[PDB]
Structures are given as structure tokens and as C-alpha cells.
PDB file of C-alpha atoms in Angstrom:
ATOM      1  CA  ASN A  17      68.357  95.363 113.938  1.00  0.00           C
ATOM      2  CA  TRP A  18      69.546  98.927 113.111  1.00  0.00           C
ATOM      3  CA  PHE A  19      71.850 101.309 114.968  1.00  0.00           C
ATOM      4  CA  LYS A  20      71.999 105.099 114.996  1.00  0.00           C
ATOM      5  CA  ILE A  21      75.456 106.664 115.105  1.00  0.00           C
ATOM      6  CA  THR A  22      75.679 110.117 116.622  1.00  0.00           C
ATOM      7  CA  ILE A  23      78.736 112.296 116.595  1.00  0.00           C
ATOM      8  CA  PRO A  24      78.250 115.280 118.900  1.00  0.00           C
ATOM      9  CA  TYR A  25      79.770 118.405 117.356  1.00  0.00           C
ATOM     10  CA  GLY A  26      79.883 116.741 113.962  1.00  0.00           C
ATOM     11  CA  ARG A  27      78.900 119.866 112.089  1.00  0.00           C
ATOM     12  CA  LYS A  28      82.220 121.194 113.336  1.00  0.00           C
ATOM     13  CA  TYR A  29      84.089 119.095 110.808  1.00  0.00           C
ATOM     14  CA  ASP A  30      84.356 118.515 107.070  1.00  0.00           C
ATOM     15  CA  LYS A  31      81.881 115.718 106.255  1.00  0.00           C
ATOM     16  CA  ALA A  32      84.453 114.305 103.865  1.00  0.00           C
ATOM     17  CA  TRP A  33      87.343 114.443 106.394  1.00  0.00           C
ATOM     18  CA  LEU A  34      85.238 113.114 109.247  1.00  0.00           C
ATOM     19  CA  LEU A  35      83.769 110.075 107.469  1.00  0.00           C
ATOM     20  CA  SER A  36      87.189 109.227 106.105  1.00  0.00           C
ATOM     21  CA  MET A  37      88.942 109.445 109.437  1.00  0.00           C
ATOM     22  CA  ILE A  38      86.300 107.177 110.922  1.00  0.00           C
ATOM     23  CA  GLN A  39      86.774 104.567 108.202  1.00  0.00           C
ATOM     24  CA  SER A  40      90.539 104.869 108.531  1.00  0.00           C
ATOM     25  CA  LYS A  41      90.107 103.539 112.075  1.00  0.00           C
ATOM     26  CA  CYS A  42      87.079 101.319 111.658  1.00  0.00           C
ATOM     27  CA  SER A  43      88.228  97.754 111.039  1.00  0.00           C
ATOM     28  CA  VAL A  44      85.518  97.195 108.406  1.00  0.00           C
ATOM     29  CA  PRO A  45      84.086  99.109 105.420  1.00  0.00           C
ATOM     30  CA  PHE A  46      80.763 100.762 106.172  1.00  0.00           C
ATOM     31  CA  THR A  47      78.362 103.200 104.534  1.00  0.00           C
ATOM     32  CA  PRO A  48      76.608 106.131 106.136  1.00  0.00           C
ATOM     33  CA  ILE A  49      73.026 105.398 105.338  1.00  0.00           C
ATOM     34  CA  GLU A  50      70.955 108.430 106.141  1.00  0.00           C
ATOM     35  CA  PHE A  51      73.708 110.807 107.141  1.00  0.00           C
ATOM     36  CA  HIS A  52      72.371 114.130 108.157  1.00  0.00           C
ATOM     37  CA  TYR A  53      72.994 117.096 110.361  1.00  0.00           C
ATOM     38  CA  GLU A  54      70.659 117.954 113.165  1.00  0.00           C
ATOM     39  CA  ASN A  55      72.172 121.051 114.721  1.00  0.00           C
ATOM     40  CA  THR A  56      75.801 120.650 115.860  1.00  0.00           C
ATOM     41  CA  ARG A  57      75.729 116.866 115.843  1.00  0.00           C
ATOM     42  CA  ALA A  58      76.158 114.578 112.828  1.00  0.00           C
ATOM     43  CA  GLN A  59      74.032 111.466 112.555  1.00  0.00           C
ATOM     44  CA  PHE A  60      73.761 108.363 110.395  1.00  0.00           C
ATOM     45  CA  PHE A  61      72.437 104.802 110.592  1.00  0.00           C
ATOM     46  CA  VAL A  62      74.053 101.390 110.448  1.00  0.00           C
ATOM     47  CA  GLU A  63      72.000  98.340 109.674  1.00  0.00           C
ATOM     48  CA  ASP A  64      74.477  96.007 111.145  1.00  0.00           C
ATOM     49  CA  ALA A  65      75.362  94.779 114.695  1.00  0.00           C
ATOM     50  CA  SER A  66      78.902  93.808 113.724  1.00  0.00           C
ATOM     51  CA  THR A  67      79.502  97.146 112.022  1.00  0.00           C
ATOM     52  CA  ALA A  68      78.131  99.180 114.929  1.00  0.00           C
ATOM     53  CA  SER A  69      80.671  97.432 117.123  1.00  0.00           C
ATOM     54  CA  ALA A  70      83.508  98.304 114.727  1.00  0.00           C
ATOM     55  CA  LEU A  71      82.278 101.899 114.632  1.00  0.00           C
ATOM     56  CA  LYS A  72      81.996 102.121 118.398  1.00  0.00           C
ATOM     57  CA  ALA A  73      85.631 101.040 118.669  1.00  0.00           C
ATOM     58  CA  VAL A  74      86.574 104.166 116.753  1.00  0.00           C
ATOM     59  CA  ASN A  75      85.289 106.298 119.603  1.00  0.00           C
ATOM     60  CA  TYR A  76      87.887 108.532 121.235  1.00  0.00           C
ATOM     61  CA  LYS A  77      90.525 107.451 118.721  1.00  0.00           C
ATOM     62  CA  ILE A  78      90.290 110.415 116.311  1.00  0.00           C
ATOM     63  CA  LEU A  79      92.095 113.569 117.413  1.00  0.00           C
ATOM     64  CA  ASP A  80      90.869 116.796 115.819  1.00  0.00           C
ATOM     65  CA  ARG A  81      92.582 119.972 114.537  1.00  0.00           C
ATOM     66  CA  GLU A  82      92.247 121.798 117.855  1.00  0.00           C
ATOM     67  CA  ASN A  83      93.484 118.726 119.717  1.00  0.00           C
ATOM     68  CA  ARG A  84      90.107 117.449 120.942  1.00  0.00           C
ATOM     69  CA  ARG A  85      88.975 113.827 120.560  1.00  0.00           C
ATOM     70  CA  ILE A  86      86.031 112.982 118.402  1.00  0.00           C
ATOM     71  CA  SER A  87      83.434 110.900 120.199  1.00  0.00           C
ATOM     72  CA  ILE A  88      80.948 108.539 118.616  1.00  0.00           C
ATOM     73  CA  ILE A  89      77.782 107.463 120.448  1.00  0.00           C
ATOM     74  CA  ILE A  90      76.019 104.325 119.254  1.00  0.00           C
ATOM     75  CA  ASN A  91      72.550 103.042 120.153  1.00  0.00           C
ATOM     76  CA  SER A  92      70.333 100.523 118.431  1.00  0.00           C
ATOM     77  CA  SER A  93      67.236 101.937 116.983  1.00  0.00           C
ATOM     78  CA  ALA A  94      64.358 101.793 114.855  1.00  0.00           C
ATOM     79  CA  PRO A  95      64.129 102.304 111.124  1.00  0.00           C
ATOM     80  CA  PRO A  96      64.872 105.194 108.853  1.00  0.00           C
ATOM     81  CA  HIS A  97      62.779 108.068 109.881  1.00  0.00           C
ATOM     82  CA  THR A  98      59.966 106.482 111.961  1.00  0.00           C
ATOM     83  CA  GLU A 102      59.160 112.759 119.694  1.00  0.00           C
ATOM     84  CA  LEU A 103      61.244 115.558 121.174  1.00  0.00           C
ATOM     85  CA  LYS A 104      64.537 116.679 119.648  1.00  0.00           C
ATOM     86  CA  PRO A 105      67.163 118.036 122.088  1.00  0.00           C
ATOM     87  CA  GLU A 106      66.604 121.443 120.573  1.00  0.00           C
ATOM     88  CA  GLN A 107      62.833 121.318 121.323  1.00  0.00           C
ATOM     89  CA  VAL A 108      63.546 120.477 124.928  1.00  0.00           C
ATOM     90  CA  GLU A 109      66.107 123.166 125.627  1.00  0.00           C
ATOM     91  CA  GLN A 110      63.523 125.429 123.983  1.00  0.00           C
ATOM     92  CA  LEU A 111      60.538 124.129 125.900  1.00  0.00           C
ATOM     93  CA  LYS A 112      62.795 124.278 128.932  1.00  0.00           C
ATOM     94  CA  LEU A 113      63.632 127.894 128.216  1.00  0.00           C
ATOM     95  CA  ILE A 114      60.047 128.939 127.752  1.00  0.00           C
ATOM     96  CA  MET A 115      59.059 127.199 130.991  1.00  0.00           C
ATOM     97  CA  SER A 116      61.709 129.166 132.865  1.00  0.00           C
ATOM     98  CA  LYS A 117      60.360 132.456 131.601  1.00  0.00           C
ATOM     99  CA  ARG A 118      57.005 131.499 133.060  1.00  0.00           C
ATOM    100  CA  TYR A 119      58.101 130.326 136.512  1.00  0.00           C
ATOM    101  CA  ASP A 120      57.628 132.691 139.446  1.00  0.00           C
ATOM    102  CA  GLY A 121      60.394 131.870 141.905  1.00  0.00           C
ATOM    103  CA  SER A 122      58.980 133.943 144.771  1.00  0.00           C
ATOM    104  CA  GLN A 123      55.864 131.738 145.062  1.00  0.00           C
ATOM    105  CA  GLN A 124      57.033 128.715 143.060  1.00  0.00           C
ATOM    106  CA  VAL A 125      54.313 129.008 140.462  1.00  0.00           C
ATOM    107  CA  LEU A 126      54.697 127.529 137.001  1.00  0.00           C
ATOM    108  CA  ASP A 127      52.237 129.035 134.557  1.00  0.00           C
ATOM    109  CA  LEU A 128      51.842 126.835 131.460  1.00  0.00           C
ATOM    110  CA  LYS A 129      48.572 128.473 130.426  1.00  0.00           C
ATOM    111  CA  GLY A 130      47.368 128.020 126.910  1.00  0.00           C
ATOM    112  CA  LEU A 131      50.995 127.296 126.063  1.00  0.00           C
ATOM    113  CA  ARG A 132      50.186 126.573 122.381  1.00  0.00           C
ATOM    114  CA  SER A 133      49.511 130.279 121.559  1.00  0.00           C
ATOM    115  CA  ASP A 134      52.887 131.702 122.785  1.00  0.00           C
ATOM    116  CA  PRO A 135      54.820 134.958 121.850  1.00  0.00           C
ATOM    117  CA  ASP A 136      58.581 134.151 121.671  1.00  0.00           C
ATOM    118  CA  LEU A 137      57.689 130.963 119.820  1.00  0.00           C
ATOM    119  CA  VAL A 138      55.142 132.606 117.594  1.00  0.00           C
ATOM    120  CA  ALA A 139      55.675 130.024 114.815  1.00  0.00           C
ATOM    121  CA  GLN A 140      59.367 129.091 115.560  1.00  0.00           C
ATOM    122  CA  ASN A 141      57.528 126.021 114.224  1.00  0.00           C
ATOM    123  CA  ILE A 142      57.686 124.065 117.469  1.00  0.00           C
ATOM    124  CA  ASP A 143      54.056 123.904 118.503  1.00  0.00           C
ATOM    125  CA  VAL A 144      54.068 123.005 122.156  1.00  0.00           C
ATOM    126  CA  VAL A 145      51.460 120.250 122.300  1.00  0.00           C
ATOM    127  CA  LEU A 146      50.957 119.360 125.966  1.00  0.00           C
ATOM    128  CA  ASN A 147      48.090 116.988 125.256  1.00  0.00           C
ATOM    129  CA  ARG A 148      50.658 114.834 123.568  1.00  0.00           C
ATOM    130  CA  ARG A 149      52.093 112.081 125.751  1.00  0.00           C
ATOM    131  CA  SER A 150      55.795 112.582 124.843  1.00  0.00           C
ATOM    132  CA  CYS A 151      55.618 116.303 125.425  1.00  0.00           C
ATOM    133  CA  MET A 152      53.934 116.315 128.863  1.00  0.00           C
ATOM    134  CA  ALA A 153      56.567 113.689 129.557  1.00  0.00           C
ATOM    135  CA  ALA A 154      59.370 116.125 128.738  1.00  0.00           C
ATOM    136  CA  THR A 155      57.624 118.893 130.687  1.00  0.00           C
ATOM    137  CA  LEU A 156      57.252 116.877 133.879  1.00  0.00           C
ATOM    138  CA  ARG A 157      60.855 115.713 133.495  1.00  0.00           C
ATOM    139  CA  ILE A 158      62.045 119.356 133.504  1.00  0.00           C
ATOM    140  CA  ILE A 159      59.916 120.115 136.552  1.00  0.00           C
ATOM    141  CA  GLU A 160      61.484 117.219 138.449  1.00  0.00           C
ATOM    142  CA  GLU A 161      65.025 118.305 137.644  1.00  0.00           C
ATOM    143  CA  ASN A 162      64.675 122.049 137.917  1.00  0.00           C
ATOM    144  CA  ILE A 163      61.688 122.835 140.146  1.00  0.00           C
ATOM    145  CA  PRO A 164      61.423 120.132 142.840  1.00  0.00           C
ATOM    146  CA  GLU A 165      59.883 122.675 145.180  1.00  0.00           C
ATOM    147  CA  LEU A 166      57.053 123.646 142.817  1.00  0.00           C
ATOM    148  CA  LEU A 167      53.883 124.633 144.709  1.00  0.00           C
ATOM    149  CA  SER A 168      51.449 125.776 142.043  1.00  0.00           C
ATOM    150  CA  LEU A 169      51.032 124.567 138.461  1.00  0.00           C
ATOM    151  CA  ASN A 170      48.667 126.054 135.910  1.00  0.00           C
ATOM    152  CA  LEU A 171      47.737 123.818 132.991  1.00  0.00           C
ATOM    153  CA  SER A 172      44.512 125.511 131.887  1.00  0.00           C
ATOM    154  CA  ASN A 173      43.556 125.821 128.235  1.00  0.00           C
ATOM    155  CA  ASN A 174      45.668 123.098 126.686  1.00  0.00           C
ATOM    156  CA  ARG A 175      42.986 120.777 125.361  1.00  0.00           C
ATOM    157  CA  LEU A 176      44.105 118.180 127.919  1.00  0.00           C
ATOM    158  CA  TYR A 177      41.951 115.077 127.876  1.00  0.00           C
ATOM    159  CA  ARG A 178      43.897 112.125 129.340  1.00  0.00           C
ATOM    160  CA  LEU A 179      45.414 112.872 132.709  1.00  0.00           C
ATOM    161  CA  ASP A 180      47.174 109.506 132.753  1.00  0.00           C
ATOM    162  CA  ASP A 181      50.027 111.225 130.886  1.00  0.00           C
ATOM    163  CA  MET A 182      50.817 113.360 133.915  1.00  0.00           C
ATOM    164  CA  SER A 183      50.166 110.747 136.598  1.00  0.00           C
ATOM    165  CA  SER A 184      53.786 110.500 137.650  1.00  0.00           C
ATOM    166  CA  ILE A 185      53.627 114.143 138.717  1.00  0.00           C
ATOM    167  CA  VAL A 186      52.740 112.858 142.142  1.00  0.00           C
ATOM    168  CA  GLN A 187      56.370 111.845 142.643  1.00  0.00           C
ATOM    169  CA  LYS A 188      57.967 114.507 140.475  1.00  0.00           C
ATOM    170  CA  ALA A 189      56.241 117.459 142.198  1.00  0.00           C
ATOM    171  CA  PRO A 190      56.067 116.358 145.877  1.00  0.00           C
ATOM    172  CA  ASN A 191      54.906 119.689 147.275  1.00  0.00           C
ATOM    173  CA  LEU A 192      52.425 120.685 144.594  1.00  0.00           C
ATOM    174  CA  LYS A 193      49.417 122.119 146.436  1.00  0.00           C
ATOM    175  CA  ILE A 194      47.686 124.217 143.773  1.00  0.00           C
ATOM    176  CA  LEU A 195      46.598 122.820 140.391  1.00  0.00           C
ATOM    177  CA  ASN A 196      44.642 124.546 137.637  1.00  0.00           C
ATOM    178  CA  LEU A 197      43.075 122.348 134.980  1.00  0.00           C
ATOM    179  CA  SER A 198      40.257 124.648 133.905  1.00  0.00           C
ATOM    180  CA  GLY A 199      39.335 125.170 130.285  1.00  0.00           C
ATOM    181  CA  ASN A 200      40.483 121.780 129.060  1.00  0.00           C
ATOM    182  CA  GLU A 201      38.890 118.799 127.423  1.00  0.00           C
ATOM    183  CA  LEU A 202      38.328 116.486 130.388  1.00  0.00           C
ATOM    184  CA  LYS A 203      35.173 114.468 129.891  1.00  0.00           C
ATOM    185  CA  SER A 204      34.873 112.211 132.867  1.00  0.00           C
ATOM    186  CA  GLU A 205      35.352 112.461 136.602  1.00  0.00           C
ATOM    187  CA  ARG A 206      37.515 109.319 136.423  1.00  0.00           C
ATOM    188  CA  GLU A 207      40.426 111.330 134.990  1.00  0.00           C
ATOM    189  CA  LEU A 208      41.108 112.823 138.425  1.00  0.00           C
ATOM    190  CA  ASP A 209      41.920 109.366 139.742  1.00  0.00           C
ATOM    191  CA  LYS A 210      45.148 109.384 137.770  1.00  0.00           C
ATOM    192  CA  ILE A 211      46.488 112.243 139.909  1.00  0.00           C
ATOM    193  CA  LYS A 212      44.822 111.163 143.130  1.00  0.00           C
ATOM    194  CA  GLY A 213      48.139 111.147 144.992  1.00  0.00           C
ATOM    195  CA  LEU A 214      48.541 114.940 145.028  1.00  0.00           C
ATOM    196  CA  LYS A 215      47.823 116.531 148.397  1.00  0.00           C
ATOM    197  CA  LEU A 216      46.111 119.500 146.788  1.00  0.00           C
ATOM    198  CA  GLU A 217      44.717 122.393 148.794  1.00  0.00           C
ATOM    199  CA  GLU A 218      43.415 124.084 145.674  1.00  0.00           C
ATOM    200  CA  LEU A 219      42.020 122.859 142.377  1.00  0.00           C
ATOM    201  CA  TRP A 220      40.280 124.286 139.292  1.00  0.00           C
ATOM    202  CA  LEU A 221      38.217 122.125 136.923  1.00  0.00           C
ATOM    203  CA  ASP A 222      35.564 124.445 135.564  1.00  0.00           C
ATOM    204  CA  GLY A 223      35.456 124.638 131.793  1.00  0.00           C
ATOM    205  CA  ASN A 224      35.565 120.867 131.534  1.00  0.00           C
ATOM    206  CA  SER A 225      32.566 118.922 130.264  1.00  0.00           C
ATOM    207  CA  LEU A 226      32.946 116.626 133.284  1.00  0.00           C
ATOM    208  CA  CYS A 227      31.177 119.373 135.255  1.00  0.00           C
ATOM    209  CA  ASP A 228      27.906 118.891 133.365  1.00  0.00           C
ATOM    210  CA  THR A 229      28.061 115.470 135.007  1.00  0.00           C
ATOM    211  CA  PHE A 230      26.697 116.650 138.350  1.00  0.00           C
ATOM    212  CA  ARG A 231      23.352 118.202 139.272  1.00  0.00           C
ATOM    213  CA  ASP A 232      24.642 120.436 142.080  1.00  0.00           C
ATOM    214  CA  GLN A 233      27.757 121.840 143.749  1.00  0.00           C
ATOM    215  CA  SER A 234      27.110 119.537 146.677  1.00  0.00           C
ATOM    216  CA  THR A 235      27.679 116.401 144.592  1.00  0.00           C
ATOM    217  CA  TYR A 236      30.489 118.006 142.610  1.00  0.00           C
ATOM    218  CA  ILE A 237      32.461 118.933 145.729  1.00  0.00           C
ATOM    219  CA  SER A 238      31.923 115.518 147.251  1.00  0.00           C
ATOM    220  CA  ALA A 239      33.258 113.753 144.164  1.00  0.00           C
ATOM    221  CA  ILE A 240      36.328 115.967 143.954  1.00  0.00           C
ATOM    222  CA  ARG A 241      36.976 115.932 147.674  1.00  0.00           C
ATOM    223  CA  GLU A 242      36.703 112.182 147.386  1.00  0.00           C
ATOM    224  CA  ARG A 243      40.039 112.274 145.552  1.00  0.00           C
ATOM    225  CA  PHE A 244      41.568 115.242 147.339  1.00  0.00           C
ATOM    226  CA  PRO A 245      40.339 115.125 150.993  1.00  0.00           C
ATOM    227  CA  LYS A 246      42.212 118.230 152.267  1.00  0.00           C
ATOM    228  CA  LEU A 247      40.908 120.429 149.422  1.00  0.00           C
ATOM    229  CA  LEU A 248      40.165 123.962 150.579  1.00  0.00           C
ATOM    230  CA  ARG A 249      39.338 125.838 147.408  1.00  0.00           C
ATOM    231  CA  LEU A 250      37.669 124.784 144.159  1.00  0.00           C
ATOM    232  CA  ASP A 251      37.321 126.945 141.064  1.00  0.00           C
ATOM    233  CA  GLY A 252      38.264 130.087 142.957  1.00  0.00           C
ATOM    234  CA  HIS A 253      35.729 129.572 145.735  1.00  0.00           C
ATOM    235  CA  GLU A 254      36.437 128.629 149.326  1.00  0.00           C
ATOM    236  CA  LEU A 255      34.916 125.309 150.364  1.00  0.00           C
ATOM    237  CA  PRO A 256      33.127 124.529 153.655  1.00  0.00           C
ATOM    238  CA  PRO A 257      35.412 122.776 156.154  1.00  0.00           C
ATOM    239  CA  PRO A 258      35.510 118.960 155.738  1.00  0.00           C
ATOM    240  CA  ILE A 259      33.204 117.099 158.120  1.00  0.00           C
ATOM    241  CA  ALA A 260      34.784 114.004 159.633  1.00  0.00           C
ATOM    242  CA  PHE A 261      33.406 110.791 161.047  1.00  0.00           C
TER     243      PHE A 261
END
């Protein structure tokens, strides 16, 4: 069992001074295996449960030059160098904001991968990646609870299960655009069945070549979203009840 020690604002101090001050308080000798900087914070591992405890007891005990306390956060963790970095998120978060229309609550995450402003920053927004859509939805839940329309077209999406918790994160989502993706089956829609969509776009997905006529297509989709009014830009015939 390993532990990862993080010192927020570690790059604000002399590596030498810092590590020494820690040891001067830590009851036992330790060794920073894999010490490295990752933006302001300093990080290193500790392959020992007893040590980690000793290290954690050093938290809040070191006063710095400008009279601030130095904090040490400790969590157990995997191995040496085996996901989204804070920096990627505040970035992804920032981009998302620039593409949210407050007036109509519309988040446009269209073809995100080919974006100006992050033209090679080296963070390639990959929404078809589980961890990333995870982060995305998480930001929506925190910052845009009242989201009404979400555009996720052209992102090579192929497994909607990754965004199946959107039902509870975006309660009022009514419009969803999934056109131009890599959905193969009709079954994928079942993972987002809970949305009370009024509008939906699926064209551009191979799942369409699954039906022989619009009649069947609309029935299948409406089967999941009963109150659907528009589909692929076209208005649908009022739902017939029984």
C-alpha cells in the first residue's frame, strides 16, 4: 500500500528547505520517492502506512516566511505513475464557459476536439473517454443546473453509458444533439432514457441505417422519449394515445 503526499503551493518554497522542515517535524526518517512539481503543488509518494501517518502529523505545523502554515494532504494511492489533472479541468471548465449561452441556457460542446484557444495547448478534449465526460457532466451539475439544451454532436461518441447520470445532473435538459457521432445501436438511447426531451438529433449515426422508414425510426425513439416533439430538425406528428 502506497500513499501520495501533496503539498499545495509547494512550488512556492525551496525544495531543499521544504523537505528539511518536514523531516524536522516528522517523527521518522522518510524519503521522497517520486518528488515532482505539477503546477503550484509539490508531490511525492510514500510506500509506507506508518510513514504516511508520521507525515500527516506534520500538517499545519510548519510556518512559512510570510507567516502562512504549510499544509500536507495525504491519500493512499496506486503505484508510481499508473485521468484529469486539476489544470485540465479548470481549462475544460473555462472552455465550456466560453461556449455556454446564458440567455437560452445552451451549452455547445460541438466537435470539441478541434478547438481554437486550445489549438494544441496539448490537452486534447476527448469526450468519448469515460473520465472526461465524467468531468464535463460534473461541471454542468455544479455550474449549470438549469441547462436546457446540450449539443454533443461530432465527438465520436459511441457508448452513452458514460453520460447516463446526466438525467440527475441536468434535470431540465429538454434539447439534446447527438448527431454526427459513432452510435451504432438503438440500445444506446436506453442509457439516457430518463431525460424528458422535447427535441433530439441522432442523424449521422449508423444506428439510423437500422430502420427501413421514418415511421419505425420515430416509433423507436419516441419509445424512449414519449413527449418528443422534434427529431433531426423536423417537427413530429402529435403523439397518438390509447
